[PDB]
Design a protein around this motif. Structure first.
Motif, short mmCIF file in Angstrom:
data_model
loop_
_atom_site.label_atom_id
_atom_site.label_comp_id
_atom_site.label_asym_id
_atom_site.label_seq_id
_atom_site.Cartn_x
_atom_site.Cartn_y
_atom_site.Cartn_z
N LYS B 122 13.96 -0.16 -17.34
CA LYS B 122 13.45 -0.09 -16.13
C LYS B 122 12.50 0.39 -16.01
N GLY B 123 11.68 -0.53 -15.58
CA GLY B 123 10.55 0.26 -14.92
C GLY B 123 10.81 1.20 -13.36
N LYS B 124 10.49 2.19 -12.65
CA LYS B 124 10.66 2.27 -11.25
C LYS B 124 9.77 3.11 -10.98
N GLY B 125 8.13 3.20 -11.64
CA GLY B 125 7.55 3.46 -10.62
C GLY B 125 6.96 5.20 -10.13
N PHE B 126 5.92 5.09 -9.70
CA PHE B 126 6.12 7.05 -9.25
C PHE B 126 7.53 7.60 -8.66
N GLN B 127 8.03 8.65 -9.27
CA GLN B 127 9.35 9.31 -8.49
C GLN B 127 9.66 11.01 -9.02
N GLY B 128 10.19 11.40 -7.36
CA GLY B 128 9.86 12.43 -6.89
C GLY B 128 11.42 13.13 -8.47
N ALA B 129 11.08 14.87 -7.40
CA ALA B 129 12.25 15.34 -8.88
C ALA B 129 13.59 14.97 -8.87
#
Ligand SMILES: CC[C@H]1OC(=O)[C@@](C)(F)C(=O)[C@H](C)[C@@H](O[C@@H]2O[C@H](C)C[C@H](N(C)C)[C@H]2O)[C@](C)(OC)C[C@@H](C)C(=O)[C@H](C)[C@H]2N(CCCCn3cc(-c4cccc(N)c4)nn3)C(=O)O[C@]12C
Ligand SMILES: [K+]
Ligand SMILES: [Mg+2]
Ligand SMILES: [Mg+2]
Ligand SMILES: [Mg+2]
Ligand SMILES: [Mg+2]
Ligand SMILES: [Mg+2]
Ligand SMILES: [Mg+2]
Ligand SMILES: [Mg+2]
Ligand SMILES: [Mg+2]
Ligand SMILES: [Mg+2]
Ligand SMILES: [Mg+2]
Ligand SMILES: [Mg+2]
Ligand SMILES: [Mg+2]
Ligand SMILES: [Mg+2]
Ligand SMILES: [Mg+2]
Ligand SMILES: [Mg+2]
Ligand SMILES: [Mg+2]
Ligand SMILES: [Zn+2]
Lengths: 122, 215, 37, 160
Positions: B122-129
């Motif tokens: 599943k895609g989650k888009g732009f995510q941080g560390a």
RNA sequence: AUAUGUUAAGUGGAAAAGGAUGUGGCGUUGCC
RNA sequence: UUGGCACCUCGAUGUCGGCUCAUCGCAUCCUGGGGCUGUAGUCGGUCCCAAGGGUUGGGCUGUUCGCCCAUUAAAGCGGUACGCGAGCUGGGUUCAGAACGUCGUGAGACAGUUCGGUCCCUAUCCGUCGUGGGCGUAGGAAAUUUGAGAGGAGCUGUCCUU
RNA sequence: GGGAUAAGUGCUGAAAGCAUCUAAGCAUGAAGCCCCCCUCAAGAUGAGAUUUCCCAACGUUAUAAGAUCCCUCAAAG
């Protein structure tokens, strides 16, 4: 779900009333313990005349938790409190009586004396 | 070995023998057809190409992937099959046991078979560390001004650069993932359904590839 | 095995040999087994 | 070389015998001629070394083709056993699993009392390797002598 | 490139006390 | 490491500890392989190979360190501006207040101590993580692919039986 | 699990009549090396392969297969 600094009621007559969890045993980095797991604890509150005294560092087996446990049949059991039983190396209870209901997982843990003395095993 | 394509329908549960709860994923694997047979002599390797989920026939002025274009239609007609939505190659199977244009039925697998399931997570888009790489937060109080930043990205004058492979924010998910050593719980010939023990990658309706387990 | 820069016979039965470019001492006594290194 | 300097076997030269107990061919050093009897060319250090080893290999070929070679191992210890499971050897040497040593061509196994094992073959090197492997299954231990030792090998024994 | 020889360590192309049947050249002697 | 020297920097190269994130070496802490043993066994001692992975949660102290409590297979030693403040903190340490001991006639000072005390910056280039456009791949195009090469993963306990 | 190795352990074996794991030969032998497992990958400019589709005349105009613009959207962002 018992971790370091969790306080637990004692469900036996060994003298200890409340203990504080010092360590969850069973491997490096282990953070939490549940029913049937063994903890190192310190007796914060004791009743007069008991064998186990306040300030002692003892070992106990967890016999009921608020988090409870999940069984393979998809059923769950949960309790209203966190309670443990002070044990010796032979996994036998230090006290001579057990108070309140204990989980049947103790039998798989081989705490048969505790299971026998418990007034109810669910 | 064995292989099939399907759509992930969703998760449910069943009760096994002795009553244990088995969480399962429902896969609908209807309309699987062998479109091509690749061989060492012609292609350099052995594989079977399987198409799945028939689509609409070619029409003039088609505006979407719902209708086959002429190259796809010719490729399917060469196998004497309807054009398919999803096409994948299986190298694990033995190509001498398939014919071009033959159906690959759910009855290929049997309950108890050990399988590997591949799919696009599943895609989650732009995510941080913190979420993408599972790093620790800084303190949330005690004067801290460091909560979800990635932290130090290198060293001083040596090396005066950030190394390749540094974990940073960016797009998360949408990657090909293979889950290994799942089990086939049940095969239902009607409804063309396979029940896979456990969970598999991807959203509902996502394409999944079922293969006999490598290990 | 004694790994030492200084390998030499320790009794009369010790024998100095060269194996794979290394100076060794072999003996009936296993304690006297030596390799230079 | 002092070492460097036959029978109805072939000795038909690379060499390849055709004796009673098999063929046993090989190549031998390529700078040494024969008349048998080998001869050392150029008298160099490598030439002399290779002359000696080639003569030794030829003598070994002759001896093996004529009368073969036999290495004997003995098993010491209570309960240690060696059976002949058809062609291969099976060793019960105190492990939790029996050990299966598989026979090889130009090599034959024999057991007496299921305690004394014998390896016979035309090739001295192959016979030695097979015996060394049977020994390596469980070498002798210094405190009681238990293990598969060579029949005529001395074992150093330590006290308790 | 030419002639003669040395090295087998990639020594050449980073170091010592010390250790060693590595190998070439001079030799002094004991036995035969 | 404590130093010696004074060669870059005083029209500024932010100092200790911690946090976050690592990365490298091997003189290896654990795990794997092996020789010797003054190795009966279970345990140990020592040396050799071995850097793949792993290698903790607290009490005290600003601490590093260290001691202690309880674990663990193990709680290794070092390098990276004693790694990392245009990533964070700011307890300590070069600041203005105040006090004690002490020294000074004094102003003040300290092999000292004590309470308090502003941490700026909208990222141009390289670098890094993601994500598009152009052209090329000797016709144009849809789909399926090989894999040169690269990245990931790599730990280990306890119990039963023999 | 397969191959090749380290420290080791050897077999055969001379120089050195013997001895010697080594000098030539032949084995074996690590969580380590190369694979095996997962992912990316032909801008791999060395730009690879397979199947299928398309086919004009006078740089220009119009086009094929095929894409887009624009619009309804979400499993994607
Ligand atoms: C918060 C903003 C101030 O930043 C800072 O105070 C700091 C946090 F950025 C700061 O202390 C920097 C880091 C300082 O530089 C360091 O100096 C050291 C000696 C060396 C070091 N390096 C080279 C090793 C340098 O980086 C220094 C000298 O600022 C005092 C920089 C110089 C250029 C400087 O004076 C500048 C101009 C300084 N300043 C005087 C403030 C003077 C004190 N002040 C006044 C105010 C204020 C005024 C009006 C209203 C309000 N609300 C507040 N807030 N703080 C300002 O008005 O603005 C800033 C930028
Ligand atoms: K290409
Ligand atoms: Mg935290
Ligand atoms: Mg905040
Ligand atoms: Mg010495
Ligand atoms: Mg060099
Ligand atoms: Mg210095
Ligand atoms: Mg000067
Ligand atoms: Mg300066
Ligand atoms: Mg300047
Ligand atoms: Mg080392
Ligand atoms: Mg406190
Ligand atoms: Mg630093
Ligand atoms: Mg910085
Ligand atoms: Mg003052
Ligand atoms: Mg005074
Ligand atoms: Mg305060
Ligand atoms: Mg590759
Ligand atoms: Zn000796």
């Amino acid at each position: 779900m018992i971790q370091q600094e969790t306080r637990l009621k004692v469900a036996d007559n060994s003298g200890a009333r409340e203990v504080l969890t010092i360590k969850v045993l069973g491997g490096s980095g282990r953070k939490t313990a549940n029913i049937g797991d063994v903890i190192v604890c310190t007796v914060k509150n004791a009743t007069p005349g008991g064998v186990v005294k306040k300030g002692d560092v003892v070992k106990a087996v967890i016999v009921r938790t608020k988090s409870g446990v999940r069984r393979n049949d998809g059923s769950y059991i949960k309790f209203d409190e966190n309670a443990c039983v002070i044990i010796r190396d032979d996994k036998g209870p230090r006290g001579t009586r057990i108070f309140g209901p204990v989980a049947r997982e103790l039998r798989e843990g081989n705490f048969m004396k505790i299971v026998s003395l418990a007034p109810e095993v669910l | 070995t064995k292989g099939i394509l399907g759509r992930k329908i969703g998760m449910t549960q069943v009760f096994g023998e002795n009553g244990e709860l088995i969480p399962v994923t429902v896969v609908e694997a209807k309309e699987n057809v062998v479109l091509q047979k690749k061989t060492v002599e012609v292609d350099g390797y052995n594989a079977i190409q399987v198409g799945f989920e028939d689509k609409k026939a070619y029409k003039k002025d088609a505006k979407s992937n719902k209708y086959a274009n002429k190259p796809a239609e010719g490729h399917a007609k060469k196998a004497d099959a309807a054009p398919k939505r999803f096409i994948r190659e299986f190298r694990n199977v033995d190509v001498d046991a398939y014919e071009v244009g033959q159906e690959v039925s759910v009855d290929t697998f049997v309950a108890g078979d050990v399988i590997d399931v591949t799919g696009v997570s599943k895609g989650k888009g732009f995510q941080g560390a913190i979420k993408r790489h599972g790093q620790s937060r800084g303190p949330m109080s005690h004067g801290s001004h460091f909560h979800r930043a990635p932290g130090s990205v290198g060293m001083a004058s040596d090396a005066s650069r950030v190394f390749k492979g540094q974990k940073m924010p960016g797009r998360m998910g949408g990657n090909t993932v293979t889950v290994q050593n799942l089990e086939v719980v049940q095969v239902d010939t009607e409804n063309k359904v396979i029940l896979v023990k456990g969970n598999v990658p991807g959203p509902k309706k996502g394409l999944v590839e079922i293969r006999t387990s490598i290990k | 095995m004694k790994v030492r820069p200084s390998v030499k016979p320790i009794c009369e039965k010790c024998k100095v040999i060269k194996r794979k470019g290394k100076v060794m001492v072999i003996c009936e006594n296993p304690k006297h087994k030596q390799r230079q290194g | 070389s002092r070492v460097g300097k036959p029978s109805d076997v072939t000795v038909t030269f690379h060499v390849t015998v055709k004796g009673p107990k098999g063929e046993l061919s090989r190549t031998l050093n390529e700078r040494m001629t024969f008349k048998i009897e080998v001869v050392r060319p150029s008298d160099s250090k490598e030439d002399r070394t290779n002359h000696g080893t080639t003569r030794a290999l030829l003598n070994n070929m002759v001896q093996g083709v004529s009368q073969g070679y036999v290495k004997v191992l003995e098993l010491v210890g209570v309960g240690y056993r060696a059976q002949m499971q058809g062609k291969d050897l099976i060793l019960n040497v105190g492990y939790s699993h029996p050990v299966e040593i598989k026979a090889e061509e130009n090599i034959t196994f024999s057991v007496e009392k299921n305690t004394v094992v014998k390896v016979e073959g035309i090739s001295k090197e192959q016979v030695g390797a097979l015996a060394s492997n049977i020994r390596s299954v469980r070498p002798p231990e210094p405190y009681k002598g238990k293990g598969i030792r060579y029949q005529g090998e001395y074992v150093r024994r330590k006290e308790g």
